[PDB]
Amino acid sequence: SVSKANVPKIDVSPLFGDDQAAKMRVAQQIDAASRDTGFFYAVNHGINVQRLSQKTKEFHMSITPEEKWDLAIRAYNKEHQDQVRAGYYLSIPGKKAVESFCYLNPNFTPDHPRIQAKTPTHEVNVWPDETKHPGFQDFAEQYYWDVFGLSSALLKGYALALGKEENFFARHFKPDDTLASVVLIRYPYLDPYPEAAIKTAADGTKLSFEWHEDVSLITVLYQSNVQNLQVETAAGYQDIEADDTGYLINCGSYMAHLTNNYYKAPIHRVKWVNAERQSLPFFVNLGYDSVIDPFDPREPNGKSDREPLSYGDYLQNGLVSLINKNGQT
Ligand SMILES: CSC[C@@H](OC(=O)[C@H](CS)NC(=O)CCC[C@H](N)C(=O)O)C(=O)O
Ligand SMILES: [Fe+2]
């Protein structure tokens, strides 16, 4: 009774290469999707998503309660005051179904100047014991760089789409300083599924996570093949078809700011489904001091009545606001 959202598949492979005309034809497809529902699937992205899913499953299904406390963010473990972002986010049986593991830039090491300075939103990742999870830390760090590479290519396409040179965003998206994160979200099957863990939208739809815009520049998402996402359009909420072979891409509210809402950050939500599944976002965040001057591609002089906002300010406020709105995940 809900209609299907228009979410085109775009072959992004030309964004990795040097065929400028072909990159422009990709850019156009990105422009079109961004102005329509705000979602598309990136196909021919080069990443082994089946192996991602398998390694992620192995982790989620083998990590023990003892380990989850030992890795827990501050919201679950007061001993871990430095873990605001990175670490384990516990479920609460009977009340909260979702659980997840977040990690940041592998280059945020104890000697990183921003870690030394204790700058907000920068943390050193926590990992489980290697002997209990062999290969996991190395797999996950490598995945960070594989999805970083895809995101750089995507950002070349968004820049071209907006009438800019292809490095317009990508120059602010750097291995040594990016605030990008990976989140490995487990949405469990539960029998019985507690009502407490199911939210209800104003329209009656049962949800697992309420409506929101993403806190990102763009978001680069892998999910299992279980339909769950909806996007608000002018025709109401529409269902996003699942595709476990591609990456679902959308703009976050930083892109909306920079573009004066020419590329809106689409409002979307997560339907409740009683299915064991994965939601594995990569949030494309810039550096803490990155500032892009806002502009408007619908105005002849390109000028915007919005003020510049540094990415670090944006991100810290955004993540707090999202927790206030939709709850601690
Ligand atoms: C379809 S919304 C994507 C995913 O939800 C999230 O990841 C939500 C909404 S985008 N994001 C967050 O909670 C922000 C996580 C930020 C992360 N802890 C960080 O520090 O970067 C889900 O529930 O499937
Ligand atoms: Fe989201």
Curated annotation (Swiss-Prot):
Q: Where does isopenicillin N bind?
A: 85, 89, 181, 187, 279
Q: Which family does it belong to?
A: Belongs to the iron/ascorbate-dependent oxidoreductase family.
Q: Which Gene3D superfamilies match?
A: B-lactam Antibiotic, Isopenicillin N Synthase, Chain
Where is it localised? Cytoplasm, Cytosol
Q: Does the keyword Iron apply?
A: yes
> Which residues hold Fe(2+)?
212, 214, 268
How it assembles, according to the record, is:
Monomer.
Q: Where's it mainly located?
A: cytoplasm
User: Does the keyword field hold Phosphoprotein?
Assistant: no
List, separated by semicolons, the cofactors it needs: Fe(2+)
Any idea what job this protein has? Isopenicillin N synthase; part of the gene cluster that mediates the biosynthesis of penicillin, the world's most important antibiotic. IpnA catalyzes the cyclization of the tripeptide N-[(5S)-5-amino-5-carboxypentanoyl]-L-cysteinyl-D-valine (LLD-ACV or ACV) to form isopenicillin N (IPN) that contains the beta-lactam nucleus. The penicillin biosynthesis occurs via 3 enzymatic steps, the first corresponding to the production of the tripeptide N-[(5S)-5-amino-5-carboxypentanoyl]-L-cysteinyl-D-valine (LLD-ACV or ACV) by the NRPS acvA.
Which reaction equation describes what this protein catalyses? N-[(5S)-5-amino-5-carboxypentanoyl]-L-cysteinyl-D-valine + O2 = isopenicillin N + 2 H2O
One GO CC annotation: cytosol
Its annotated pathway reads: Antibiotic biosynthesis; penicillin G biosynthesis; penicillin G from L-alpha-aminoadipate and L-cysteine and L-valine: step 2/3
The protein's name: Isopenicillin N synthase
MF annotations from Gene Ontology: iron ion binding; isopenicillin-N synthase activity; L-ascorbic acid binding
Residues the record annotates as the site (Transition state stabilizer) are 209
| Residues annotated to bind 2-oxoglutarate | 277
